[PDB]
Amino acid sequence: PKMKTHKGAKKRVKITASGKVVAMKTGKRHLNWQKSGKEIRQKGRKFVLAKPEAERIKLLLPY
């Protein structure tokens, strides 16, 4: 009774004012040793998901 906000999710995802799900980019914290500048740069931004988008949305809600 009373759903629990999936703390593990909110700790890594943001819900955009329109209704989209934004999350950081993977692949930039380790594998690196000399990846292009182009790589790491584009790994700094954040993005959007699509269908799993709708999966997480449900794990928050009170949020």
Binding site: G8, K11, R12, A23, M24, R29, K46
Partner: protein, 100 residues
């Protein structure tokens, strides 16, 4: 959950400042009330009147801002947007917050 592979929990927490032990750090919270909505009614607006009628709700810190058209009325607040400041400057009077 599921597949039983990696969910998508492959993504990661840039949500640094996730939180400390003693927890929340209490501090003044400013809510923006857009002056176009403020302009609606008249007389002289104050933090109380604003919450007393629809916006604010004891969030306590009043901040007129945003787009619209300023009423020539007096408007006590906790902070004005640069932009808001001027629209109302060229039409009426504008005092700052109490202090603490």
């Amino acid at each position: 959950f599921e597949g039983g592979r990696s969910t998508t929990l492959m993504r990661l927490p840039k949500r640094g400042m996730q939180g400390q032990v003693p927890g929340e750090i209490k501090r003044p919270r400013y809510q923006g009330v857009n002056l176009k909505d403020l302009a609606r009614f008249e007389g002289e607006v104050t933090p109380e009147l604003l919450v007393r009628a629809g916006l604010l709700k004891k969030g306590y810190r009043l901040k007129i801002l945003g787009e619209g058209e300023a009423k020539p009325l007096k408007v006590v607040a906790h902070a004005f947007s640069k932009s808001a400041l001027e629209k109302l400057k060229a039409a009426g009077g504008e005092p700052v917050l109490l202090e603490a």
